[PDB]
Amino acid sequence: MQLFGGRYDFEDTEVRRSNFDNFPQALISVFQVLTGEDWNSVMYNGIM
Amino acid sequence: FPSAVTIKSWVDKMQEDLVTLAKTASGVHQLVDIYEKYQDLYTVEPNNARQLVEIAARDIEKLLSNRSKALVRLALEAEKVQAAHQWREDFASNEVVYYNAKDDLDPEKNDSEPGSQRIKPVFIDDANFRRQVSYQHAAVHIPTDIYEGSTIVLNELNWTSALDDVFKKNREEDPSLLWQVFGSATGLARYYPASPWVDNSRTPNKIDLYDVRRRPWYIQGAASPKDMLILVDVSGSVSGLTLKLIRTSVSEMLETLSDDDFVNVASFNSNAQDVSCFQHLVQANVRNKKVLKDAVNNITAKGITDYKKGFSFAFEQLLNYNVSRANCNKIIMLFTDGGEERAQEIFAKYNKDKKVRVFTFSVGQHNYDRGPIQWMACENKGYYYEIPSIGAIRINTQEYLDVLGRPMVLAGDKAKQVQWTNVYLDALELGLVITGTLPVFNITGQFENKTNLKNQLILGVMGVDVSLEDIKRLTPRFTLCPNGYYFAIDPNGYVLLHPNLQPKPIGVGIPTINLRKRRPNVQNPKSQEPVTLDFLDAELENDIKVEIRNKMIDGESGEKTFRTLVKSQDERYIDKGNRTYTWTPVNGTDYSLALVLPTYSFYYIKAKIEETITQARYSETLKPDNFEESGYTFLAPRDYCSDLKPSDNNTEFLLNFNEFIDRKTPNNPSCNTDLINRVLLDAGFTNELVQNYWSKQKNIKGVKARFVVTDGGITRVYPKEAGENWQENPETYEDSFYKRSLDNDNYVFTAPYFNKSGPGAYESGIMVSKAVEIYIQGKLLKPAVVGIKIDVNSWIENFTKDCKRNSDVMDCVILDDGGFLLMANHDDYTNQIGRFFGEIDPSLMRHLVNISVYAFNKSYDYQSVCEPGAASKQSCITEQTQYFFDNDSKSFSGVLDCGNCSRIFHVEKLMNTNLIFIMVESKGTCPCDTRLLIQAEQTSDGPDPCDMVKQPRYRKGPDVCFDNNVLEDYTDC
Numbered sequence A: 001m002q003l004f005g006g007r008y009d010f011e012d013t014e015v016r017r018s019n020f021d022n023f024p025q026a027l028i029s030v031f032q033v034l035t036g037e038d039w040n041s042v043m044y045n046g047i048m
Numbered sequence B: 001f002p003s004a005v006t007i008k009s010w011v012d013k014m015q016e017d018l019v020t021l022a023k024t025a026s027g028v029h030q031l032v033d034i035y036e037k038y039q040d041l042y043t044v045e046p047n048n049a050r051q052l053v054e055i056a057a058r059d060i061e062k063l064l065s066n067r068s069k070a071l072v073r074l075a076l077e078a079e080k081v082q083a084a085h086q087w088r089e090d091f092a093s094n095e096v097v098y099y100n101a102k103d104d105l106d107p108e109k110n111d112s113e114p115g116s117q118r119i120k121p122v123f124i125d126d127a128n129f130r131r132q133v134s135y136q137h138a139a140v141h142i143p144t145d146i147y148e149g150s151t152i153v154l155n156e157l158n159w160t161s162a163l164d165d166v167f168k169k170n171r172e173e174d175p176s177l178l179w180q181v182f183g184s185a186t187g188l189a190r191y192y193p194a195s196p197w198v199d200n201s202r203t204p205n206k207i208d209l210y211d212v213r214r215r216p217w218y219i220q221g222a223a224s225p226k227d228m229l230i231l232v233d234v235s236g237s238v239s240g241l242t243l244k245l246i247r248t249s250v251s252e253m254l255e256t257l258s259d260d261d262f263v264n265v266a267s268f269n270s271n272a273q274d275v276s277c278f279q280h281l282v283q284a285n286v287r288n289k290k291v292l293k294d295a296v297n298n299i300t301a302k303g304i305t306d307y308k309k310g311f312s313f314a315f316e317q318l319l320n321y322n323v324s325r326a327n328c329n330k331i332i333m334l335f336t337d338g339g340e341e342r343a344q345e346i347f348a349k350y351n352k353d354k355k356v357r358v359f360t361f362s363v364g365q366h367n368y369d370r371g372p373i374q375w376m377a378c379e380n381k382g383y384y385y386e387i388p389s390i391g392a393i394r395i396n397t398q399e400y401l402d403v404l405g406r407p408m409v410l411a412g413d414k415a416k417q418v419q420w421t422n423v424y425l426d427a428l429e430l431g432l433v434i435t436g437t438l439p440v441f442n443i444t445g446q447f448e449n450k451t452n453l454k455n456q457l458i459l460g461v462m463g464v465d466v467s468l469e470d471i472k473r474l475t476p477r478f479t480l481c482p483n484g485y486y487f488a489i490d491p492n493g494y495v496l497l498h499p500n501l502q503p504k505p506i507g508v509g510i511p512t513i514n515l516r517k518r519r520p521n522v523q524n525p526k527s528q529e530p531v532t533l534d535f536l537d538a539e540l541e542n543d544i545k546v547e548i549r550n551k552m553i554d555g556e557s558g559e560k561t562f563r564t565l566v567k568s569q570d571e572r573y574i575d576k577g578n579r580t581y582t583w584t585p586v587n588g589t590d591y592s593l594a595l596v597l598p599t600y601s602f603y604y605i606k607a608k609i610e611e612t613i614t615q616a617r618y619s620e621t622l623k624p625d626n627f628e629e630s631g632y633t634f635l636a637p638r639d640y641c642s643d644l645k646p647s648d649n650n651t652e653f654l655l656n657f658n659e660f661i662d663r664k665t666p667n668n669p670s671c672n673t674d675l676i677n678r679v680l681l682d683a684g685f686t687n688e689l690v691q692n693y694w695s696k697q698k699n700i701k702g703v704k705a706r707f708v709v710t711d712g713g714i715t716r717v718y719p720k721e722a723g724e725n726w727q728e729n730p731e732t733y734e735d736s737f738y739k740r741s742l743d744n745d746n747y748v749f750t751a752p753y754f755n756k757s758g759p760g761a762y763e764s765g766i767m768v769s770k771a772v773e774i775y776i777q778g779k780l781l782k783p784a785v786v787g788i789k790i791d792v793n794s795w796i797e798n799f800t801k802d803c804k805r806n807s808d809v810m811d812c813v814i815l816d817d818g819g820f821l822l823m824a825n826h827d828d829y830t831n832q833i834g835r836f837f838g839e840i841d842p843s844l845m846r847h848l849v850n851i852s853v854y855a856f857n858k859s860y861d862y863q864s865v866c867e868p869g870a871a872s873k874q875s876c877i878t879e880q881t882q883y884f885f886d887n888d889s890k891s892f893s894g895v896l897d898c899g900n901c902s903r904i905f906h907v908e909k910l911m912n913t914n915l916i917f918i919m920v921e922s923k924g925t926c927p928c929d930t931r932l933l934i935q936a937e938q939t940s941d942g943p944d945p946c947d948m949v950k951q952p953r954y955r956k957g958p959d960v961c962f963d964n965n966v967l968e969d970y971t972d973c
C-alpha cells in the first residue's frame, strides 16, 4: 500500500485489477504473489 | 538621374500611347454610339430599391410561412397519433414494415430481423434532390450503436408510420418542398422522401456515427437557449483513466452548445481557476468553443478536492450581468468521480429558490462514493449521469436536454413556435440549408389528465429544410448590375444570404494533424459545425457598416449612402465604390434583408423587342459555325428556361441554348421572356460592333484580342485563336474585371498571374478594360465592358525607345494600382510578370507605402483550405492583403536608404488610368534586403479570440425563454 497505493493512475483504458488500493485488495494481491500465479504481471504494473 | 519634368513629359507620351491604343482598338465610343443609336429596341426602367427589398422580404416571408404550416400539421398528427398507440410487445407476430436506410438494397440479401420487415423501393432519380429518391414512403435512420428491434425502437416504427400520409400531403400541396423529417426522442429518424443514406454501416469501410438527438436542428427545438458553466474536478484522485474521460466529455458536452447559448468552463482543486482566458460566459460560437476545447485538453490533476470553492466560483460566474448573456436556463454541471461532502451550505444561499440547475456526472470506473453527488443533483432539480467508458460519453452528454425541455412541454401551445436554424451543410449532401423546427409533445390521456409520469418529455422534434438555392430564387439580381446584391442577416449578425458565403465550412485555427498517429482504416468524425460567417466578416468592415449592421439586427428599416471600398472578386484589388444600402425586416421571422446598389445602377434596360424578324436576325449571331466573322462567342449559364440546363461546358450549353430558339419561338409559355430577350438584344449590339468596327481594323499592331463582356452574358473574343486563351468565367456576373471596370471612370489594366498553369502571359497578354457609359434621357447606364488583351512584346519596344534594356545604371517599371508588375525594363523582372512587386524588390515597395503612395487592408477569409502543419485539406483561416492607391497626388520624389547607400527613385502616375510609372537607380548598386513583402492568402490564426470577447459585437437574443415552471416534476434523477 505504501509503495503502490494510488500509483496505478495510468491513462490507458485497460483494467489492472490486481492492484494495491484498499487493504482487502492489497491482501488479495499479496496472496496472489505467494501462490506464484501471474506474479510478474503484478510487478510490471509496479515498475510502470 | 533625369529631372522630374523629364519623367513628367515622358510618362505623358506613353500614357497617351496606351490609352489611344485602347480607346481606338476596343471601340468604347462606338458601342456607346449604338446603344444610343437605337433607343427603342429597349426601354430604361428604374430599380426602386425601396420597392425591390419590400417585394423580396415578402417572398421569404411567404416561403418560410408556407414551410411553417406544413410543420404545424405534421406536429399535430404526431401528437394525436401517438396518444392513440397501444405499446405492444408482440412484434414477431405482427411485423412492422418499413424501409431502413443504410441497408443493402440487393434483393438476394434477405436478412429479415425479428419484429421488422424491410422494403425494397424503386428510386427514381430527381432534381431538387441531387440523389435517387422514392416518393412512396419515408426512410428510417437508426443510429449505429442503437439496436433496431428493441421494443423501445420497434414501437416507434409502429406509431411513427402514420406520418407517411402527412408527409405525402405536404409535397402534393407543394412540389418544391425538401426533406421532411421527424427526429425521435428514441434516436430514430424518419424522413420523406426515402433515399439510401450516404454512409452505409458496413458495406463501405467508413461508418456513420450520426445521431438525431445530437443534431443542431433537433437541439434548438428541443429546449430553450442556455447559459451553462462546466465545472471540472481536477483533484488528484481523478488523475488516471477518469481524468482521460473528462476531457472527452467536456469537448462532447460543447458540441451540444449553440451560438445562442453562452458558456464558460471552470475547474477546481482547492481553488477554482477558470480553464482559459475568458472569465465570463462567452457566446460559444465556433471560435470561442475552439478555445475552450483547447484548454480543457491540457489539464493536469493535482490537489485537494473542494466543492465549496468550486460552487462559489460557479455561482459568481453565473451572476455577472454586465456581460452579454443568454439569461435563460441557468445551469451548472460538474464532472467528478466521488464526493464525501455534499456542500449543503453553498446551495442554501446561492440558490435558495433553486433558480440554478445542477447536473453531476460521475466518471470512470472507481470506488469513490456517489451518494453525495446524487444528492446534489436531486436537491437542485438537475439529473445524474454516469460515464464509465468512451462509448458512454455520446448519449449522456446529449441527454440533459430531456431535463431542460420540461418547462417547455408544460407551456402548452405557447411553446410551439417555429424556429429557423443557422445555415449548415445538409446531412444528405443537398448543400447549404436552414431547417425550421417544431417540437412534438407526448400527450396521452389528455382528455382526463390520467398520467403525466413520462408526459413531461418531448416525443421528438420535426424539421423541414429550406435550401439556400430556394431563397436565392426570391432575390433576383439580373436587372441590377454585377455590383448590386441582396444580403440576409440573423439577429446574431450572421449572414443568411450573401455573395461571399460559401459551401465549405468556416474554419478555425491553423490545421495540424499528426501523420505519425493516424492508423490507416478507422474513420474519425468529419464535421458538424454550422457555417456561421458574420456580416462584418463577409465584407470589409467599416464603422459606417457596423452602424448599418446593428441597425438591422434590431429590426429597423432604412437606407444609407456612403463611400466605401469594395474588395475585388479575385483577392488582389480594392476599389473605392460609392454604394447605397437599403434594409428592411422580413416580418414573419427574425431575418432582416438588405440590398446594395452602386449609384448608376438605379436604372436598368428592359428589352422591348418583339418583332418576328428582329428576334430572328439577332439569334443566328450566336452560332458556333458563324464565329469566323463574329468572334468566339460565349454565353452565361443563366436559368433561361426551365428545360435547358447550365452545363459548365460552354460549347455544350450554347448549342442547347441555340437549338432551343430554332426548335421553338422565344415566347415559350413556361419561360421568362425578358431574360432571353435581353440576351438577344445584346447579341445584336455586340454584333454591330464586331461587324462594323472591329472587322474593319482586322489587325492592330500591338493588339492581341478584343472582347466585349456584356450584360446578357455574351462575351465575344474576336479571333477564334484568341478565344482559346480566354480563361474567364463565361458568366458575366462573376468576372472580376467586369466589376472593376464599372467602379472606375478610367481605363483599367489587369495584371496577368505569376506562375500557375495554362498560357497567361506572352500568349494572351495584359488586359485593359473599360465600362461603356451611356445617357438616355439624362439617365446614367453602364451596359457593357469593352477591352483588349495587349501584346507584351510590342509594348516593350515603345517603352525602350533613360532606360536601356538590361541597364546597370537605373531601372524603371510600370505598376498598376495594387502594386502588381506589368512592365519591367531589366528583363530579369519581365519574365516574372504579373507578380507582386514587393517580391522582386521588397526594399523599394516597403518605402513606397511609407511615402503614402500606397495603402492596404488585411482581411480574414474564414472559408479557405490549406495544407496541414506537422504538430488532404482542412479548412483554415487565411489573411489576405490587398493594396490600393490612397493618395490622389500625381508624383512622388524622394530617396530611400538601406544603411550606407542611397537610391533616388522618382514616381509619376499616368493620368486617365490606374497605371503608375517609377524610375529608380539599379538595385545592384546598393546590396539591400529588408524582408520579402508578399501579398498572398497567407495562413494565419487570427484574430485572437480572448480580445474580441472583451468587447463583443452587438447581438439580440430570443424573446421567449421557457424555464422554471412551478409545477415541474423535479423528482426524477
Ligand SMILES: *[C@@H]1O[C@H](CO)[C@@H](O[C@@H]2O[C@H](CO)[C@@H](O[C@@H]3O[C@H](CO)[C@@H](O)[C@H](O)[C@@H]3O)[C@H](O)[C@H]2NC(C)=O)[C@H](O)[C@H]1NC(C)=O
Residues within 6 Å of the ligand: B081, B094, B095, B158, B159, B160, B161, B162
Ligand atoms: C402499429 O402496428 C399495428 C400492428 O400492425 C397496427 O394495428 C393494426 O391496424 C390495422 C388498421 O388500423 C388493423 O387492420 C384492421 O383489422 C381488423 C381485424 O383485426 C379489421 O376489421 C379492420 O377493417 C382492419 O383491417 C390491424 O388489425 C391492426 N393490428 C392489430 C394486431 O390490431 C397499427 O395500425 C400500427 N400503428 C400505426 C400508427 O400505424
Ligand SMILES: *[C@@H]1O[C@H](CO)[C@@H](O[C@@H]2O[C@H](CO)[C@@H](O[C@@H]3O[C@H](CO)[C@@H](O)[C@H](O)[C@@H]3O)[C@H](O)[C@H]2NC(C)=O)[C@H](O)[C@H]1NC(C)=O
Residues within 6 Å of the ligand: B082, B087, B442, B443, B444, B451, B452, B453, B454, B455, B459
Ligand atoms: C408517452 O408517454 C406514455 C405515458 O404517458 C408512455 O407510455 C408508457 O410507456 C411505458 C414504456 O416503458 C409503458 O410501460 C411498460 O408497460 C408494459 C406493460 O404493457 C411493461 O411490460 C413494461 O415493463 C413497461 O412497464 C407504459 O405502458 C406506457 N404508459 C401508458 C400510460 O400507456 C410512452 O412511452 C410515451 N411515448 C413515447 C414515444 O415514449
Ligand SMILES: *[C@@H]1O[C@H](CO)[C@@H](O[C@@H]2O[C@H](CO)[C@@H](O)[C@H](O)[C@H]2NC(C)=O)[C@H](O)[C@H]1NC(C)=O
Residues within 6 Å of the ligand: B053, B054, B055, B057, B058, B584, B585, B587
Ligand atoms: C412589414 O409589416 C409592417 C407592419 O408590421 C408593414 O408596415 C406597414 O406598412 C403599411 C404600408 O405599406 C402601412 O400602411 C402601415 O401603417 C405599416 N404598419 C404599421 C403598423 O404602421 C410593412 O409594410 C411590412 N413590410 C413588408 C416588406 O412586408
Ligand SMILES: *[C@@H]1O[C@H](CO)[C@@H](O[C@@H]2O[C@H](CO)[C@@H](O)[C@H](O)[C@H]2NC(C)=O)[C@H](O)[C@H]1NC(C)=O
Residues within 6 Å of the ligand: B541, B855, B856, B857, B858, B886
Ligand atoms: C483601410 O484602408 C484605409 C486607407 O485608405 C484606412 O483608412 C484610413 O485609416 C487611418 C487609420 O488607419 C485614418 O487615419 C485615415 O483617416 C483613414 N482614411 C480614410 C480615407 O478612411 C482604413 O482604416 C483601413 N481599414 C482597416 C480596417 O485597417
Ligand SMILES: *[C@@H]1O[C@H](CO)[C@@H](O)[C@H](O)[C@H]1NC(C)=O
Residues within 6 Å of the ligand: B017, B018, B021, B702, B703, B794, B795, B798
Ligand atoms: C507605340 O507608338 C506608336 C506610334 O505612336 C503607336 O502607333 C503604338 O500604338 C504605340 N504602342 C502601343 C500600341 O502602345
Ligand SMILES: *[C@@H]1O[C@H](CO)[C@@H](O)[C@H](O)[C@H]1NC(C)=O
Residues within 6 Å of the ligand: B059, B062, B063, B066, B173, B174
Ligand atoms: C406558398 O404557398 C402558396 C399556396 O400553396 C403558393 O401559391 C405559393 O407559391 C407558395 N410560395 C412559395 C414561396 O413557395
Ligand SMILES: *[C@@H]1O[C@H](CO)[C@@H](O)[C@H](O)[C@H]1NC(C)=O
Residues within 6 Å of the ligand: B563, B576, B577, B578, B743
Ligand atoms: C460618390 O458620391 C459623390 C457625391 O455624390 C460623387 O461625386 C462621386 O462621384 C461618387 N463616387 C463615385 C466613385 O462615383
Ligand SMILES: *[C@@H]1O[C@H](CO)[C@@H](O)[C@H](O)[C@H]1NC(C)=O
Residues within 6 Å of the ligand: B850, B851
Ligand atoms: C514613415 O517612415 C518613417 C520612418 O521610417 C516612420 O517613422 C513612419 O511611421 C512612417 N509613416 C507611416 C505612416 O507609417
Ligand SMILES: [Ca+2]
Residues within 6 Å of the ligand: A035, A036, A037
Ligand atoms: Ca505457477
Ligand SMILES: [Ca+2]
Residues within 6 Å of the ligand: B235, B236, B237, B238, B304, B305, B338
Ligand atoms: Ca477528489
